[PDB]
Structures are given as C-alpha cells and as structure tokens.
Enzyme design. Structure first.
Site, PDB file in Angstrom:
ATOM      1  N   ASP A 145       0.856  -1.181   0.000  1.00 38.08           N
ATOM      2  CA  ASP A 145       0.000   0.000   0.000  1.00 38.08           C
ATOM      3  C   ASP A 145       0.894   1.232   0.000  1.00 38.08           C
ATOM      4  O   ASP A 145       1.906   1.240   0.699  1.00 38.08           O
ATOM      5  CB  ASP A 145      -0.895  -0.010   1.238  1.00 38.08           C
ATOM      6  CG  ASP A 145      -2.050   0.977   1.203  1.00 38.08           C
ATOM      7  OD1 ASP A 145      -1.815   2.163   1.403  1.00 38.08           O
ATOM      8  OD2 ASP A 145      -3.207   0.526   1.011  1.00 38.08           O
ATOM      9  N   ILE A 146       0.486   2.263  -0.750  1.00 39.07           N
ATOM     10  CA  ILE A 146       1.298   3.464  -0.904  1.00 39.07           C
ATOM     11  C   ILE A 146       1.227   4.340   0.359  1.00 39.07           C
ATOM     12  O   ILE A 146       2.124   5.141   0.575  1.00 39.07           O
ATOM     13  CB  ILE A 146       0.937   4.241  -2.190  1.00 39.07           C
ATOM     14  CG1 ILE A 146       2.007   5.297  -2.495  1.00 39.07           C
ATOM     15  CG2 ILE A 146      -0.464   4.834  -2.098  1.00 39.07           C
ATOM     16  CD1 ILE A 146       1.919   5.962  -3.834  1.00 39.07           C
ATOM     17  N   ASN A 164     -13.177  -2.923   3.140  1.00 41.36           N
ATOM     18  CA  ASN A 164     -14.008  -1.759   3.393  1.00 41.36           C
ATOM     19  C   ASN A 164     -15.071  -1.665   2.304  1.00 41.36           C
ATOM     20  O   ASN A 164     -14.774  -1.850   1.123  1.00 41.36           O
ATOM     21  CB  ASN A 164     -13.203  -0.464   3.412  1.00 41.36           C
ATOM     22  CG  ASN A 164     -12.161  -0.441   4.510  1.00 41.36           C
ATOM     23  OD1 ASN A 164     -12.382  -1.011   5.577  1.00 41.36           O
ATOM     24  ND2 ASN A 164     -11.074   0.284   4.275  1.00 41.36           N
ATOM     25  N   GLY A 210     -15.319   3.345   4.751  1.00 37.05           N
ATOM     26  CA  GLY A 210     -14.113   4.099   4.433  1.00 37.05           C
ATOM     27  C   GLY A 210     -13.402   3.542   3.211  1.00 37.05           C
ATOM     28  O   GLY A 210     -12.167   3.585   3.132  1.00 37.05           O
ATOM     29  N   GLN A 211     -14.187   3.009   2.271  1.00 33.88           N
ATOM     30  CA  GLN A 211     -13.622   2.430   1.066  1.00 33.88           C
ATOM     31  C   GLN A 211     -13.094   3.566   0.191  1.00 33.88           C
ATOM     32  O   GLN A 211     -13.864   4.440  -0.187  1.00 33.88           O
ATOM     33  CB  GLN A 211     -14.683   1.623   0.318  1.00 33.88           C
ATOM     34  CG  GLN A 211     -14.163   1.041  -0.975  1.00 33.88           C
ATOM     35  CD  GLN A 211     -15.178   0.182  -1.686  1.00 33.88           C
ATOM     36  OE1 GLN A 211     -16.360   0.092  -1.320  1.00 33.88           O
ATOM     37  NE2 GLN A 211     -14.705  -0.432  -2.760  1.00 33.88           N
ATOM     38  N   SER A 212     -11.804   3.527  -0.121  1.00 30.89           N
ATOM     39  CA  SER A 212     -11.113   4.652  -0.725  1.00 30.89           C
ATOM     40  C   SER A 212     -11.008   4.523  -2.257  1.00 30.89           C
ATOM     41  O   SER A 212     -10.769   5.526  -2.908  1.00 30.89           O
ATOM     42  CB  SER A 212      -9.742   4.806  -0.100  1.00 30.89           C
ATOM     43  OG  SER A 212      -8.979   3.627  -0.318  1.00 30.89           O
ATOM     44  N   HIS A 248     -10.615  -4.577  -2.663  1.00 30.15           N
ATOM     45  CA  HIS A 248      -9.276  -4.883  -2.180  1.00 30.15           C
ATOM     46  C   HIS A 248      -9.331  -5.399  -0.743  1.00 30.15           C
ATOM     47  O   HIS A 248     -10.082  -4.882   0.109  1.00 30.15           O
ATOM     48  CB  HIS A 248      -8.350  -3.661  -2.303  1.00 30.15           C
ATOM     49  CG  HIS A 248      -8.915  -2.398  -1.760  1.00 30.15           C
ATOM     50  ND1 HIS A 248      -9.946  -1.727  -2.383  1.00 30.15           N
ATOM     51  CD2 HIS A 248      -8.589  -1.647  -0.707  1.00 30.15           C
ATOM     52  CE1 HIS A 248     -10.217  -0.624  -1.695  1.00 30.15           C
ATOM     53  NE2 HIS A 248      -9.418  -0.565  -0.662  1.00 30.15           N
ATOM     54  N   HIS A 278      -7.087  -5.539   2.484  1.00 34.08           N
ATOM     55  CA  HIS A 278      -5.921  -5.063   3.217  1.00 34.08           C
ATOM     56  C   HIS A 278      -5.359  -6.195   4.070  1.00 34.08           C
ATOM     57  O   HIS A 278      -6.133  -6.952   4.656  1.00 34.08           O
ATOM     58  CB  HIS A 278      -6.292  -3.909   4.172  1.00 34.08           C
ATOM     59  CG  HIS A 278      -6.854  -2.659   3.544  1.00 34.08           C
ATOM     60  ND1 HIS A 278      -6.069  -1.576   3.196  1.00 34.08           N
ATOM     61  CD2 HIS A 278      -8.120  -2.323   3.200  1.00 34.08           C
ATOM     62  CE1 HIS A 278      -6.838  -0.618   2.668  1.00 34.08           C
ATOM     63  NE2 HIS A 278      -8.115  -1.044   2.673  1.00 34.08           N
TER      64      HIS A 278
END
Ligand SMILES: Nc1nc2c(ncn2[C@@H]2O[C@H](COS(=O)(=O)NC(=O)CCc3c[nH]c4ccccc34)[C@@H](O)[C@H]2O)c2nccn12
Lengths: 115, 112
Positions: B29-30, B85, B91-93, B98, B100
């Site tokens: 993850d960035i 998420n 809080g799905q960005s 995906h 985590h």
C-alpha cells in the site's frame, strides 16, 4: 462433537445461545456479544479451522462464502451506508477465539487506521 | 479498472508487487498504516464487495488465501489483520475490491 469446543464450536451445536442472523450447511452468522459498532456480527464456518494462517488451499470457496454471506447479511440488516469486514490472525491481530471468523461492522463511520 | 488499481493491474503506473497470478495481484500500500501493509485485489473489476456475485465466491476466497501466503512470506509470524471496506461508512477509498493485510505491530480494538 464436530466443530470443536471453542465457544464458536458450541454455538454451532446450539449448546450456547446466540442471536443468529443466518445459517446454512457451511456457515453461521450471529451478533457479537461485545459490539464495537451499532451493528457488529460474525460469520463463521461450521468446519473448524483454527485461524486463517492454517487455512488449506481447499478452504478457498468456504472463505469466499463467509464474505458473500457477510455482504448479504449486511444488506438484509439495512447497512445501506457501508461496513467493514475484519479477520484477525494471532497475537498482533488480537485474535481471542481460535476458530476462523469474519467480523462485519457498521451503522457508524468507521475510522482509519483499522486499529 | 477505471481506477488507479486498474492502472496498477495494467502496469501503467509503479507499485511494489509482492505476488501475481492469472486472477489477482498483491502489492504494498502506498500509504501504509503498519510496518507491513499490503493489498490483494482481483484482476476482475468488482467495484465493491456489496455487488460481488455468487460465483465470485472462490475468487474472493483466493484473495484471502493469497493474502495469508504473502503474510507468511513477508515474515508476519506474530499475526496480522485482514480488512475489506465497503462504502462511505466502511471508508472504502477505491471502487475496486481490495483486501488489506496489516501487521508488524499490535493491531488495536475497535478496528476503526
Ligand atoms: N455472540 C458471541 N460472541 C462472542 C462470544 N465470545 C466471543 N465473542 C466475540 O467473538 C469475537 C472474537 O473475535 S477475535 O478477533 O477473535 N477476538 C477479539 O477479541 C478481537 C478483538 C480484540 C480484543 N482485544 C484486543 C486487543 C487488541 C486488538 C484486538 C482486540 C469478539 O468480537 C467477541 O466479542 C460469545 N459467547 C456467547 C455468545 N457469543
């Protein structure tokens, strides 16, 4: 006694009461006794797997099924603003019960980081 | 993927790839929230878990198996947390499913 004698194994065999949302041949969904959000429930397999780190390759579609049943139950409970699914592994994950389970949390804004 | 994760899958932008097969990709993850924080995503564009289909079940399972194998490979022997998420409360960005995987420190409760 299939399902083990973790607390979850006893819930599967109806030896300990729980508030069951959904049941099929592969899994059971029920409300968590210490909820961390307005809605907080668990999806567990009936097959006893101690933790995700020891899941077999052949357990793939069962783990998938936990997530499909999770999102279906979330929808049936009216979590229409969203939710968070969590699996905890071992000591760093905070795992307390050694039977694989998926948490589904909703009914409020979940924050980042996820603990 | 009309998302950044689509661009990652298509190899159009950089990411530190951990594992790849014909149906999923794992990468760091960035914006990591733990000493180890990576993602496992399907190559198929499922926008969010709420709209996953019944026959995506073994694929979603595959993400978690691939995640637990990457975790072991990366030395997460004291344990970890997996998170998916959904939606704004979740809080799905990114609107590409995906998983985590976070470890390398004590993860707390509640999980957000
Ligand atoms: N319905 C019902 N629920 C029960 C019962 N017993 C346990 N649970 C439920 O199982 C979960 C285990 O998740 S888990 O990751 O293994 N365990 C955790 O406890 C993770 C969270 C955690 C606790 N302390 C931490 C410290 C750091 C990081 C994470 C944590 C918890 O959320 C419990 O509340 C029970 N008996 C009868 C009916 N019952």
């Amino acid at each position: 006694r299939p399902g083990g004698d973790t607390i979850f194994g006893k819930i599967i065999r109806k030896e300990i009461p729980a508030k069951i949302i959904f049941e099929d041949d592969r899994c059971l969904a029920f409300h968590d006794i210490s909820p961390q959000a307005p809605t907080h429930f668990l999806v567990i397999p009936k097959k006893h797997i101690s933790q995700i780190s020891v899941a077999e390759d052949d357990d793939e579609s069962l783990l998938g099924h936990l997530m499909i049943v999770g999102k279906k139950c979330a929808a049936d409970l009216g979590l229409n603003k969203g939710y968070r699914m969590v699996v905890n592994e071992g000591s760093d994950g905070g795992q307390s019960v050694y039977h694989v389970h998926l948490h589904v949390l909703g009914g409020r804004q979940m924050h980042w980081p996820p603990g």
